[PDB]
Design a protein around this ligand. Structure first.
Ligand SMILES: Cc1ccc(N)nc1
Length: 163
């Protein structure tokens, strides 16, 4: 575990992370994809061997000794708000199980279902609150990665609010 488990947020490419493992915002088929998934495929292509997994689950594949946790959030274009909310919560619970099993002291994590799976809605708060519900009982240092300057400020505010 980390000495004093924390949450942080950085605005940069998660492929440049300084953590002991990474969470990919994966598709269910283990395809290279777009956004985070494309950056992760470029950086860790070996981790896409047999990475296909259903919605609401996470599957870890090693790139050398570096763990890539493929977490499949729902595409809100296809799911109802209710069913999508349940699957998005479940994906993060499976990430917390993997992070714990791996025994890492730190993890880099994107906000699942906030980009091309958002069904064109702002899901910062919904996705971040499911991340906290899952990760709060873990003792890894969590570093959240985002692209957008306004999102960085809002995520930083949400973290600071609860400290
Ligand atoms: C949110 C986001 C988008 C791309 C990337 N490489 N990391 C994080």
């Amino acid at each position: 575990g980390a000495m004093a488990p924390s949450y942080r947020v950085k605005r940069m490419d998660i492929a440049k992370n300084d953590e002991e493992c990474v969470v990919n915002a994966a598709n269910p088929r283990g395809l290279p994809g777009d956004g985070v998934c494309k950056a992760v495929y470029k950086k860790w292509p070996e981790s896409f061997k047999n990475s296909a997994t259903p919605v609401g689950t996470a599957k870890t594949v090693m790139c050398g000794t570096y763990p890539v946790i493929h977490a499949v959030g729902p595409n809100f274009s296809n799911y109802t708000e209710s069913e999508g909310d349940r699957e998005l919560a479940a994906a993060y619970r499976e990430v917390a199980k993997e992070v714990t099993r791996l025994g890492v002291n730190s993890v880099a994590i994107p906000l699942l279902s906030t980009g091309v799976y958002s069904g064109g809605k702002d899901r910062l708060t919904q996705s971040l609150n499911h991340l906290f519900t899952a990760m709060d009982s873990t003792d890894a240092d969590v570093v959240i990665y985002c692209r957008d300057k306004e999102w960085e400020k809002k995520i930083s505010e949400a973290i600071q609010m609860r400290t």
